[PDB]
Design a binder for these strands. Structure first.
Ligand SMILES: [K+]
Ligand SMILES: [K+]
Ligand SMILES: [K+]
Ligand SMILES: [K+]
Ligand SMILES: [K+]
Ligand SMILES: [K+]
Ligand SMILES: [K+]
Ligand SMILES: [K+]
Ligand SMILES: [K+]
Ligand SMILES: [K+]
Ligand SMILES: [K+]
Ligand SMILES: [K+]
Ligand SMILES: [K+]
Ligand SMILES: [K+]
Ligand SMILES: [K+]
Ligand SMILES: [K+]
Ligand SMILES: [K+]
Ligand SMILES: [K+]
Ligand SMILES: [K+]
Ligand SMILES: [K+]
Ligand SMILES: [K+]
Ligand SMILES: [K+]
Ligand SMILES: [K+]
Ligand SMILES: [Mg+2]
Ligand SMILES: [Mg+2]
Ligand SMILES: [Mg+2]
Ligand SMILES: [Mg+2]
Ligand SMILES: [Mg+2]
Ligand SMILES: [Mg+2]
Ligand SMILES: [Mg+2]
Ligand SMILES: [Mg+2]
Ligand SMILES: [Mg+2]
Ligand SMILES: [Mg+2]
Ligand SMILES: [Mg+2]
Ligand SMILES: [Mg+2]
Ligand SMILES: [Mg+2]
Ligand SMILES: [Mg+2]
Ligand SMILES: [Mg+2]
Ligand SMILES: [Mg+2]
Ligand SMILES: [Mg+2]
Ligand SMILES: [Mg+2]
Ligand SMILES: [Mg+2]
Ligand SMILES: [Mg+2]
Ligand SMILES: [Mg+2]
Ligand SMILES: [Mg+2]
Ligand SMILES: [Mg+2]
Ligand SMILES: [Mg+2]
Ligand SMILES: [Mg+2]
Ligand SMILES: [Mg+2]
Ligand SMILES: [Mg+2]
Ligand SMILES: [Mg+2]
Ligand SMILES: [Mg+2]
Ligand SMILES: [Mg+2]
Ligand SMILES: [Mg+2]
Ligand SMILES: [Mg+2]
Ligand SMILES: [Mg+2]
Ligand SMILES: [Mg+2]
Ligand SMILES: [Mg+2]
Ligand SMILES: [Mg+2]
Lengths: 259, 186, 183
RNA sequence: UAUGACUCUCUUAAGGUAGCCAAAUGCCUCGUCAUCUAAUUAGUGACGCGCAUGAAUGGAUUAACGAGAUUCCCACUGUCC
RNA sequence: UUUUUUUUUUUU
RNA sequence: CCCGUCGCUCCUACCGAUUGAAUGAUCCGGUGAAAUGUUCGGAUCGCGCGAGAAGUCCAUUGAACCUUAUCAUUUAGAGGAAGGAGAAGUCGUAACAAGGUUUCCGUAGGUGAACCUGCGGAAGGAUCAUUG
RNA sequence: UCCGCCGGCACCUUAUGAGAAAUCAAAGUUUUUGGGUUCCGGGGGGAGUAUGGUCGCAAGGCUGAAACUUAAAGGAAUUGAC
RNA sequence: UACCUGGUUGAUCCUGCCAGUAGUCAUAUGCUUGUCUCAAAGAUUAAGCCAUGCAUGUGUAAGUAUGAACAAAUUCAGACUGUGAAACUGCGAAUGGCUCAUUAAAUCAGUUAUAGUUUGUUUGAUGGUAUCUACUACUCGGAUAACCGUAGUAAUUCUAGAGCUAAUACGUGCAACAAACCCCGACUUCUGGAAGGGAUGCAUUUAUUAGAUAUGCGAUGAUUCAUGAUAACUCGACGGAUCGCACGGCCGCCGGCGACGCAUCAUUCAAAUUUCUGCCCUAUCAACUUUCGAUGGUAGGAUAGUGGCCUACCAUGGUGGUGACGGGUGACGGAGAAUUAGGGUUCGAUUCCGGAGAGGGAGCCUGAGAAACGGCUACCACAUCCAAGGAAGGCAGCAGGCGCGCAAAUUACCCAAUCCUGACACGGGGAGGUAGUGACAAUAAAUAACAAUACCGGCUGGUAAUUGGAAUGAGUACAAUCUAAAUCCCUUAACGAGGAUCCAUUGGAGGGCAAGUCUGGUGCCAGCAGCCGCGGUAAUUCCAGCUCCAAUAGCGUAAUUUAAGUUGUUGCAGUUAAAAAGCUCGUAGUUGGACUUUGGGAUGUCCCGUUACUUUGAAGAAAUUAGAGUGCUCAAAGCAAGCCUACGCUCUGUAUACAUUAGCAUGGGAUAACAUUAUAGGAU
């Protein structure tokens, strides 16, 4: 190609969007934004496919152009705006507040949240470095940049950000014994407590996480998101509490519900 | 145009490579600046990849040169080119390229020395006291003294005139100065 | 790109390896005549389905008993067979799947059930009724003799409410004869 | 169809084998075919009942050589226009 | 230990 | 039962003068459009200055063409010579019996044709055998 | 002369072995398939031919096709006929 | 889902192939063809050539209106504040679509790196010194389009003058005002401090300096890295002379919500280059590369950046039987497709990913992004028009035409769905969808069912162009429905079946292989026959009639898989069937004897150099494949959907598995590979 691609084929669209094979020849290509294309949920998908407020692309555009949907307390009129992990989507007209969280199967879910839980979010710190004039700053994995951060805060930590004031109100250091959620890989959407960390020079760090039921799984450092200090997450989790259920017991539960 | 690609080259085994695509704009090259010393300064503006800007010096007369031992940077005149390691013909042509050895006017550095150390190579009491205090650590290279005697100083160009459009550099000192003086004394 | 191209399809039967086995031909003709099939393709399709199911059951049986995959797939297959009536409750093991014959599947055809429950005087009469839209499974009219009737839906078979044998509005022949006799 | 592997015969002992060719050797003849040219009684290659080729009256070929006879091409030019 | 060549096509 | 020359029809390739031909890619040298940079140049336009066209100089990329040679894929050719196939052709009888000279291999020579002969070898011989 | 050991050219008997058998004490220990390793065959002709390369004084040696053609060719053994 | 059968003979057992049987999301062709649902479709030969039409344009309250454009108002005043064509300005056209020509460590797959670079845009943060003596900042200057009027030419979004008038166009310019740091520094109560002056925003360039960590000081495995300070430098496209809504508090000054725009960092969307391993046939290709870059070094130029990418000098290096180099490919690579005991064999032009091309080369402007071709420039090959002076070209885009061939569709409708794009909720989109042709391929499924009578075989069954009434879709058609509008499907008024003429075909009947020693004709003829064989006057085999057999809306005929243990690694052969070099040596290659810590007591636990290999983990696009759930009437499918009609609920579901080699991490130390051992220069 001679430049940037503006189209995204439906088959090439990420699987967790759950788009129909015969729905069309194209899928909404995520726009540039805080989150990566492969790890985001466009507002078009949220409004049309998930919440079913809009029955078509045109209805999605019409709804969004009325300034009725806010992301992180800011009105967004871009249909392909990339809304990703921990993002807050608020519709004042319907008095609806959602947080984007991975389900046990690794797919984005709009977990309903209270008005008090909708005023903040959690971000993961990438690195801390000095800017111009020697001013310290840190950048999160959602494209945010905060100046004059707490000196204790460092890379891979989590920060509680109050959106109304756009300020850090608390932070969690990345350490063993903290409840975390996996944001990537096959174990995406699982919730557990870190058991140990294996560090290899010039190579990815491994993190071992134990599920609330005792199940153990390992992942990479970049796929681990800290949700709280100790074992209590700072935010309300979706249904299932990040507990992955085997197909056998899932079928048992389905049959029990059937009968 | 000029290309930086490896398609035209031979394989490390010596075998020939068969073309499979045309030249690309992102691997292009451009003609050399061939900057020279002349009173008619000429710098051309080049629009490069991403909309950035480059400066091609066709002719330069003055340069920003630094005396490292005294930590003094002054804008002086470039007199001539004396030595060029890469190619001797560049010395004959007076080409201005990075790492080339040139001779620069010593007038600004002489003036700074006179004003700072009060030595040639009214005043208030505080000024003479300051000069006397500075005189304690006044150590000067005899070779640099002889160079100042002639009014010209040997310098090395540390910038790239064909990329930044400036022939900036530093005055030779110590072992480097001795090495280049030995190479020039022939 | 044409979006229709992404729709997939597959075959449902295979031709016999040896076209002219006399015993095979006799057995196939016997089954076709007994069950009122239009051609050997239907019998071969039923055989293909039975072979697929038996192969799946055999593959599962190869695995270790405590294998989660074996447990899950065997439970699914047994549930499917129980739903479609191939296996009874007492037949609650994968081994009884291997003991399934083409006759077991043929007995579940809507044509066979219609003939058996007494709505038709013969298998061919039943076929004609279903293809003429005189039969409904639940509240839905079914005109496919190959329709596989589930155990739950077996007892709901009844004449179509819009047909002469299930409701009113007799056929065009009867109406024409009545009009002719009216004079 | 044609010829004749084969058989028998006459003068005069035999009946041109291997080869080669319109040859410095062929009358017919500027033979026939291909090639070289715009055009070739020339050159080359091929064919052969060859007026009248043919085996130390030596047959066939042959690198290297030749003030030896021949044809063509490039360069060159007052040979010529 | 003299000499002794040959037998049309298909089929039974 | 069977071998070959010779005789007829057809098919497939092989050799071949023609210093054969075509196409593509590389090799040697030469010419070389256009564009770019550079030198000179100054129609003209604005306030002694600023901008600046045509044109010109030398370089860079370099199409295109010519010369030399080598590979790769095709293809024409007078004529020459092989193989194969085809119901009832001619001359012999070479191979199968000890096939009427046992057969066969290597090599050399010679005859219409199969083939004959010389030297050495094998049994796949027609002898598993003379302490006679 | 007699009794033994090692190595060698061979022979006779035998199948619990192999094999299509003829036969083989290695041609055995092979669908109960595997000790290590080199060469080499893929129906019969065309053909050990054409072409290229290489060796040779030559004769020829080594390497070595294809087009096309064909339902058999061939091995062991049985009966008869000769 | 581990399978064979006919054919050499008088007969037998073999080797061995030929033939048969089955498969192809495999092409083509022959015949036939009633219904429903899906659906490939000028790749193969020519990346050959193209008439004609279309496929890229774009407007918000928020850049620029005086159309001599429309409309409503104004009786008197009004710069304009409603629509606005045209035009300037900005953005886009580098996406998408098409094709597979070139290309054999090259593209490409997995796996790495940029501490070796660029990145319009989106998202989060950050913008302090310009005039300093001119002196608009209550706001600078000169043009030009549209418009109008003089036209040239045969002619083109070919083209010259003349008269106006705008900017978020162009060119300038105060740039609201400071502090701090550094240098010079008169003067001076002089180890001092001091007036004054210079420098000082952000950006660029070069130097000096700090950036520690066995009473302050960040990050990495790793950086003189991030960043700070100083000295200077640059004739800096930077540091807002822009626009829409509203309308307010103090005494003219302040004041909200936005739009657009410039600069820095981070982020996102990406590119470029890059680490390791991996590709078909060929030795009738064994040496190749190095004048003129080949391998490496030093210094430079160029590049966004690394690098012989290029220049100057220097050295002789670099690859190769572990197959370099050269050649062939009817060779784009992969995801995948066909067949499936296992191992394997064959295919992959084509909708997804990556690459390349726009008739063949080369060069280049614009732009964040192009070596762009529905952009330009030149040559070459073709080629349209001409008034003969010139001028215009690129369908391997959607249709369509010629040619080529065995071989492939309409010069239709639409932006309604999916999504892309622009100034933009609105325009455009031959991308994409709808419909037309369509027996590529796939799914379901009509052509009859039931009684009476007569015949038959044992109340029970079969046959009958005999009788009798019932049923229905193929067709036809109001209507509704569907649909962007149509059409089709589904539903359904009135019609629509007795030789139910509403008439089923394709191949065969000696064997393989199911089905006639029937009848007439021909007489080694004509012909059949994949193979074996039929036909010579009594032909189950030809040509026909009857009858019968296989499949069935399908069937026959003309590269590839299986069968093939006839390519054999699993797993073939070499005495006579084809086969072991005449014999020995011998380098590459392959292979290579034994030996080094076992046991009990107890109870996973306590006691006496480099690799192969194996266990586990992470990660490893979708689609396809396997597979869970789900009555599209069933099915191929699809990702739907279910209860009850609650102005709702199921947080509804949209799992899971597989994935060679190569890479990363982890446990084991049997079996193996390489190195080492003793002249002690050994350990401590
Ligand atoms: K005589
Ligand atoms: K002689
Ligand atoms: K002479
Ligand atoms: K015959
Ligand atoms: K003989
Ligand atoms: K013999
Ligand atoms: K003779
Ligand atoms: K296709
Ligand atoms: K425009
Ligand atoms: K653009
Ligand atoms: K790769
Ligand atoms: K530090
Ligand atoms: K590859
Ligand atoms: K570079
Ligand atoms: K270098
Ligand atoms: K490629
Ligand atoms: K742009
Ligand atoms: K077209
Ligand atoms: K649309
Ligand atoms: K048969
Ligand atoms: K007769
Ligand atoms: K007859
Ligand atoms: K027959
Ligand atoms: Mg594209
Ligand atoms: Mg003669
Ligand atoms: Mg002679
Ligand atoms: Mg005779
Ligand atoms: Mg004889
Ligand atoms: Mg004899
Ligand atoms: Mg004799
Ligand atoms: Mg053979
Ligand atoms: Mg098999
Ligand atoms: Mg026989
Ligand atoms: Mg091709
Ligand atoms: Mg590589
Ligand atoms: Mg950016
Ligand atoms: Mg630094
Ligand atoms: Mg360098
Ligand atoms: Mg190709
Ligand atoms: Mg492909
Ligand atoms: Mg195509
Ligand atoms: Mg593609
Ligand atoms: Mg291109
Ligand atoms: Mg073309
Ligand atoms: Mg072109
Ligand atoms: Mg181009
Ligand atoms: Mg294009
Ligand atoms: Mg085009
Ligand atoms: Mg076709
Ligand atoms: Mg079909
Ligand atoms: Mg019909
Ligand atoms: Mg039979
Ligand atoms: Mg007859
Ligand atoms: Mg017949
Ligand atoms: Mg074999
Ligand atoms: Mg023999
Ligand atoms: Mg043999
Ligand atoms: Mg031998
Ligand atoms: Mg040898």
């Amino acid at each position: 190609a001679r430049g940037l691609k503006k189209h995204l084929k439906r088959l090439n669209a990420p699987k967790h969007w759950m788009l129909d094979k015969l729905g069309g020849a194209f899928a909404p290509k995520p726009s540039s934004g805080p989150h990566k294309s492969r790890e985001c949920l466009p507002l078009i998908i949220i409004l049309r496919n998930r919440l079913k407020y809009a029955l078509t692309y045109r209805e999605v555009i019409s709804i969004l152009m009325q300034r009725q949907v806010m992301v992180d307390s800011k009105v967004r009129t871009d249909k392909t705006y990339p809304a990703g992990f921990m993002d807050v989507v608020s519709i004042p007209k319907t008095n609806e507040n959602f947080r984007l969280l991975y389900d046990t199967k690794g797919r984005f879910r709009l977990h309903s949240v209270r008005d008090e839980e909708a005023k903040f979010k959690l971000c993961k710190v990438r690195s801390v470095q000095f800017g111009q004039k020697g001013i310290p700053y840190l950048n999160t994995y959602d494209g945010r940049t905060i100046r004059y951060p707490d000196p204790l805060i460092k890379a891979n930590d989590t920060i509680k950000l109050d959106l109304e004031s756009n300020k850090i109100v608390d932070f969690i250091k990345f350490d063993v014994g903290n409840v975390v959620m996996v944001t990537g890989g096959r174990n995406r959407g699982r919730v557990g407590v870190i058991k140990n960390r294996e560090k290899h020079k010039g190579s990815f760090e491994t993190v071992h996480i134990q599920d609330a039921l005792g199940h153990e799984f390992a992942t990479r450092l970049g796929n681990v998101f800290t949700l709280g200090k100790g074992t209590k997450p700072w935010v309300s989790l979706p249904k299932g509490k990040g507990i992955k259920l085997s197909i056998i017991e899932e079928a048992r539960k389905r049959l029990a519900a059937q009968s | 145009g000029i290309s930086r690609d490896s398609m035209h080259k031979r394989r490390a085994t010596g075998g020939k490579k068969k073309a499979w695509r045309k030249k690309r704009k992102y691997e292009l090259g451009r003609q050399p600046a061939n900057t020279k010393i002349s009173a008619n300064k000429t710098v051309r503006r080049i629009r490069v990849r991403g909309g950035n800007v480059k400066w091609r010096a066709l002719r330069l007369d003055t340069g920003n040169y630094s005396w490292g031992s005294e930590a003094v940077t002054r804008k002086t005149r470039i007199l001539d080119v004396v030595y060029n390691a890469s190619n001797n013909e560049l010395v004959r042509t007076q080409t201005l390229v990075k790492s080339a050895i040139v001779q620069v006017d010593a007038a600004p550095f002489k003036q700074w020395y006179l004003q700072h150390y009060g030595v040639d190579i009214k005043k208030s009491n505080h000024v003479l006291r300051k000069i006397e205090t500075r005189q304690k650590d006044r150590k000067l290279d005899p070779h640099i003294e002889e160079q100042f005697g002639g009014g010209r100083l040997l310098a090395c160009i540390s910038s790239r005139p064909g990329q930044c459009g400036r022939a900036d550099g530093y005055i030779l000192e110590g072992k480097e100065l001795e090495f280049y003086m030995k190479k020039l004394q022939k | 790109v044409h979006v229709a191209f992404y729709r997939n399809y597959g075959k449902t039967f295979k031709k016999p390896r040896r076209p002219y086995e006399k015993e095979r031909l006799d057995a196939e003709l016997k089954l076709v005549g007994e069950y009122g099939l239009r051609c050997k393709r239907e019998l071969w399709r039923v055989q293909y389905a039975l072979s697929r199911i038996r192969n799946a059951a055999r593959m599962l049986l190869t695995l270790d008993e405590k294998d989660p995959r074996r447990i899950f797939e065997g439970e699914a297959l047994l549930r499917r067979m129980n739903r479609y009536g191939l296996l009874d409750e007492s037949q609650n093991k994968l081994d009884y799947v291997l003991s399934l014959t083409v006759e077991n599947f043929l007995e579940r055809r809507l044509q066979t059930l219609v003939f058996k429950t007494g709505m038709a005087k013969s298998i061919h009469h039943a076929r004609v009724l279903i293809r003429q839209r005189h039969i409904r499974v639940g509240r839905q009219v079914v005109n496919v003799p190959s329709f596989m009737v589930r155990l739950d839906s077996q007892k709901h078979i009844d004449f179509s409410l819009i047909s002469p044998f299930g409701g009113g509005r007799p056929g065009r022949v009867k109406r024409k004869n009545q009009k002719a006799a009216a004079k």
